[PDB]
Design a protein around this nucleic acid. Structure first.
Ligand SMILES: Nc1ncnc2c1ncn2[C@@H]1O[C@H](COP(=O)(O)OP(=O)(O)OP(O)(O)=S)[C@@H](O)[C@H]1O
Ligand SMILES: Nc1ncnc2c1ncn2[C@@H]1O[C@H](COP(=O)(O)OP(=O)(O)OP(O)(O)=S)[C@@H](O)[C@H]1O
Ligand SMILES: Nc1ncnc2c1ncn2[C@@H]1O[C@H](COP(=O)(O)OP(=O)(O)OP(O)(O)=S)[C@@H](O)[C@H]1O
Ligand SMILES: [Mg+2]
Ligand SMILES: [Mg+2]
Ligand SMILES: [Mg+2]
Lengths: 442, 440, 441, 59, 58
DNA sequence: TCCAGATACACAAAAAAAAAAA
């Protein structure tokens, strides 16, 4: 059988070395003298490496002269073969890939050789017992695997990591940026715990029906759009853009939502609406997608298109993740939810922007004495919680207990945070404006 | 090419088993039906096992009767061959040597087969790179010698228990013992119960999200590094290394973690950080790995390299075992979990170093009225429960009930222990310092 | 198509009959005259049966004489064939297996014959209807079952049961044992009201926490181990073997538990401990297991292994049944406890040894005016009280009433006995030594 | 083979038809029997039958 | 079908961000015994040569 | 592999009773 090898890869490596000299540093750290297969190729590579290490400039003429000095010019095919190799070079940009291919082929060939060597033993014990045969397998495989080393995926001593951490904390002494390092939510208490909405993270807001989930997410997105510079993308798979716009106008302009919807407004309400209209038309930092049944690929494509068009994004909202469709798994729901969650996390990591994805809760919450949500109430949510960087629930006590002393107030439960504290935050809820607010009072 | 085999040993063992049956128990633990080379011998051994396990007496007549019940006498060679096996056997006093030699020959043949498999697997990679092939080769070679683990988990007689009790009483009589033998955990009650993290054991720390698994593991690792001489190896598969160093500085200097993260510090905090850094650079006995999705083979290789370079290890931490990937079992999860647990146990036995493998619990735990974990709530609980030596759980009631009067207190539950008592321990939890301390 | 038979099996049967005559009673109840297949084999078997029934010794000479009498020497292959019949027999220890193989061959041959007869009759109704054919088939297939004469399980007539019961009663009557017919418990009153721990029974000892439950169980185990011969098996799901061993040493050597735990002893205590250790090492008839959360199959397998190693058991103890786990029924506790109790009862029946399983009590006992426990107080325990054979509760009046004039005395109330009277006994308690004793005065 | 998915599909189809035709749609529904076990007999949103989507999709 | 396979190879190479050229695609197709179906290296070379520019690739 | 409907045993226990404390 033909051993695995790529002569074209070796020719490309030689051509790239001849044509380009500034990239020798990267090539020198990936290939050796014994990695090449063809003997004339080995001689040519040895000569080129010797010339390059000698410090002399590399060119076809000097390479031919050096080969003639050792009388190996005719052995490697002559000057014509070298000229053909130089002419057949595709480009010098991808010499690293060629070197990696050559190294991989050498590794697999040596592994096959070691396998044949161990296989030969056993057909001729030569006095060795089973224990000796077992022992002289691990040593050979470890020898053939030790040549490759992870870079830099290796254990590190405390000195380097401690020095890097000291450097990090020394530069962070200046410019505190008032605590928040990501996207300002607008609520001081939640800013203290979450330290803003960090990028490359997945944030999940979940609650029972009619709790204030879409309102909370829209408030966060509106504050981000008002403060930040890059646009904020919203995927409204539940409601049309008209209703979201009416809610935003009611929230910003301090105008009753019902009067806006029914068209019963006085002069002051119109003045407030005109002011917020002027502000919104001056900003131009909001995008709404009202399409239904979007697949993860479509969401990714549209997000990438917007990001490339405007150079970046600030925040992405999905409402909600259970309404997305994966046609390849229409016969299974749990796997579909897992794929949706993994795709959302991958998109968040790729675009380096936070993604606020909403979710629903199971009906087991209301069949218990205590109605406070937990992490198990999310529907089909092994993956929903496994790959979530922050889970925030919404709980209003006045819904279940009409006589509760916490009327006109809501609690945000941080059920999970990888690098932050957890707890509860109390916020004032004003439904007629579709707005949350800081708790000025007790 | 003649593969390694020996018909004489098979004939002798078959004749001996036919001749005498009181020796079946001694031989049944050394050979298996698939070890025999030729097919008729495998059929004969299968029939012998079926007859003997049923309790019926085994002779030539009943064996020939059994083989006829499935139309198999012709394939073996008829009653004549069995009669020849019964007659030509001189004796059966040295049957165990034949069992050992046939097992050795079968092992050699299996190793030859695995070598041929790896050799042929490299000519048609089918989209696989060199690292995957090397990992598969290492796994195949290692799985051959790993199967020699059995004959355990049985009730003890009176003599062993009495000797252990007398040794314990004598050790209690002796004062210079300090109550611990292995790695001191730094906590009072935990040392009283577990007697330290004993060597060559697998420890499983399991808790719900946001409970204090990483904090507890890091505290144990810091205590081991401060006390022991040989270094401590940490496999961080989820967190960056800088965050781990920040947590360690906060825990050792009693400085708020948020202050370090944000950069608002005073003079006392800087002095404490300087002293802690001085101590840490004086010790220099910790190693942190931040790779993601490590295979068991890579973990084993890195651990062995570190041990050879430094001459020994004291503690190994994995965070966590649910992230490790087995390339050959990407289509099954329970088998992958079993393989990971077995590999960790084998590494712990080989290096004589305890391994702290964190785990996560199923979501059905939160549906019950009582939120405290049990041994049956583990994710893929079977293999992990079977292969573990010390299972600990972390429970904080303030996470579920904010109004609970147990603020600033965590409960450690010892769900399993082979050589010790089970129970519960309460510890003081200080979140801002990411530290577990003793409870008054 | 060759009919199902094996000439080697019948040849071995007749050879074993000729060689040995001391096991004829062990083989005459299986094979019959017509159950053989080969005609010469049937003839020689009939001759052997005729010789044996006459009481005459059986050997080659007698067989040859009988064959000459019936002039069947040529019909049986000659005297050389007769010698070969008794020559190719390895051993006579497995004659019953050969006999049952021959019987099975005869049965399957008869079944094939009946099936062929039914098939032949089907194609030739001879003026019969489908119902008649079905009835004929039912009768033919039922005749084979009726003529079985040997079937495992199933209903049995009253004569055999009566004979076995009378034999058991006579055997018990011929052996004087002073009213004890089981395993000695160590207490006179308990033995009088229980006749020891009978086999194939599930015994439950239950009490409130910190009442002397484990102490009573270990006292029974120590007494049984000292008295009996076959080993005792203990499953400790709460304490390791070390604590149990320390308690046993303290009880048998009359040494304070606190002194043993703290390591402070004296010369007399050391001498007593050495003597107890020597006696226990001389006996060596106990086993302790500490694995937690044992499934019923695991304990069954371990008990089977120990019994096979030592050729029997004397007592199996579990402490306690409420810690065992059944993975398949984790969604309901009541069904899990029912399965645990059923498995314990099945193990007791199979190994023919008494099983003792400990259990707890509900907190509802405290609410009621009377603190004396009853059957219903056991925890999730429908099958616990519906499957046990003897239930005993440990009651200490001093715990609830410090002014009671019965300090240091624990009363055992027999809450249930399926085949005996119910009642209560009084025993003294020794906390400083952790040992129950008989009450006097 | 699955009643919950069938009810979810029915509710989704009704909502889609209402959105398409631009017309109010009244979908009468039943209630579960868990209401009868409570001292307060006033219905709640969670008492609808096989009704994840019924209460998560209605306006 | 050969175009389908070569497009699958191109998608696999470019989705990870690694550079794509004749050598990389040829070595990727050869690793799975699929270079013979598409016509060998000659067809890939002809395809690379026959394209003047990508001005209207969209 | 989750969601939803329904029969039955058990845990107390929960309050209420309520006795009785006042
Ligand atoms: N004018 C108003 N006055 C008082 N409350 C109002 C008014 N308008 C809306 N609300 C309430 O505001 C809340 C808005 O709920 P949302 O958060 O928008 O919906 P949701 O939480 O996403 O739940 P879904 O999507 O319907 S399952 C509801 O509880 C309404 O009853
Ligand atoms: N920076 C911090 N400031 C304050 N409290 C913190 C901080 N980080 C963690 N905590 C708290 O300390 C607890 C310790 O949990 P950790 O062990 O750090 O995380 P965890 O148990 O690994 O959660 P996972 O990784 O999602 S399973 C957290 O649950 C928080 O309550
Ligand atoms: N030194 C001692 N002096 C006096 N009483 C003691 C001493 N040591 C133990 N005891 C008591 O002896 C009794 C025997 O304990 P146990 O029989 O184990 O009660 P138990 O709680 O039912 O055990 P379980 O069911 O296995 S948890 C307990 O009530 C102890 O309080
Ligand atoms: Mg909504
Ligand atoms: Mg963690
Ligand atoms: Mg006990």
């Amino acid at each position: 059988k033909v051993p695995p090898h790529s002569l074209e890869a070796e020719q490309s490596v030689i051509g790239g070395l001849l044509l380009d000299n500034e990239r020798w540093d990267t090539v020198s750290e990936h290939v050796m003298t014994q990695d090449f297969y063809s003997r004339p190729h080995r001689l040519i590579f040895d000569g080129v490496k010797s010339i390059l290490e000698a410090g002399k400039p590399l060119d076809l003429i000097t390479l031919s002269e050096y080969l003639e000095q050792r009388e190996q010019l005719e052995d490697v095919g002559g000057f014509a073969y070298l000229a053909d190799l130089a002419k057949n070079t595709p480009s010098a940009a991808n010499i690293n890939a060629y070197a990696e291919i050559v190294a991989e082929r050498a590794l697999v060939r040596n592994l096959i050789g070691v396998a044949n060597e161990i296989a030969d033993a056993g057909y001729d014990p030569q006095g060795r017992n089973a224990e000796d045969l077992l022992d002289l397998a691990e040593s050979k495989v470890f020898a053939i695997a030790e040549a490759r080393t992870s870079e830099n995926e290796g254990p590190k001593n405390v000195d380097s990591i401690l020095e890097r951490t000291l450097e990090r904390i020394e530069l962070l002494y200046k410019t505190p940026q008032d605590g928040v390092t990501g996207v300002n939510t607008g609520f001081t208490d939640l800013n203290k715990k979450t330290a803003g909405l960090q990028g490359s993270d997945l944030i999940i807001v979940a609650a029972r029906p009619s709790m204030g989930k879409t309102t909370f997410a829209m408030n966060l997105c509106e504050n981000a759009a008002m403060e930040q510079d890059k646009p904020v993308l919203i995927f409204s798979l539940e409601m049309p853009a008209e209703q979201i716009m009416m809610r935003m106008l009611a929230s910003l302009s301090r105008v009753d939502q019902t009067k806006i919807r029914t068209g019963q407004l006085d002069d002051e309400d119109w003045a407030r609406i005109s002011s917020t209209m002027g502000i919104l038309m001056e900003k131009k930092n909001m995008y709404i997608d009202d399409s239904s049944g979007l697949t993860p690929t479509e969401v990714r494509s549209r997000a990438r298109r917007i990001a490339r068009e405007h150079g970046g994004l600030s925040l992405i909202m999905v409402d909600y993740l259970q309404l997305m469709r994966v046609p390849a798994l229409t016969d299974n729901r749990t796997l579909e939810i897992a794929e949706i969650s993994r795709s959302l996390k991958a998109l968040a990591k790729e675009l380096n922007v936070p993604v606020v994805a909403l979710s629903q809760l199971n009906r087991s919450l209301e069949q218990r004495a205590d109605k406070r949500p937990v992490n198990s109430d999310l529907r089909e949510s092994g993956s929903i919680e496994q790959d979530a960087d922050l889970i925030m629930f919404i709980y209003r006590d006045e819904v279940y207990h009409p006589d509760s002393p916490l009327k006109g107030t809501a609690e945000i439960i941080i059920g999970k945070q990888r690098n932050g504290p957890i707890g509860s935050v109390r916020l004032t809820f004003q439904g007629h404006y579709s707005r949350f607010d800081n708790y000025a009072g007790p």
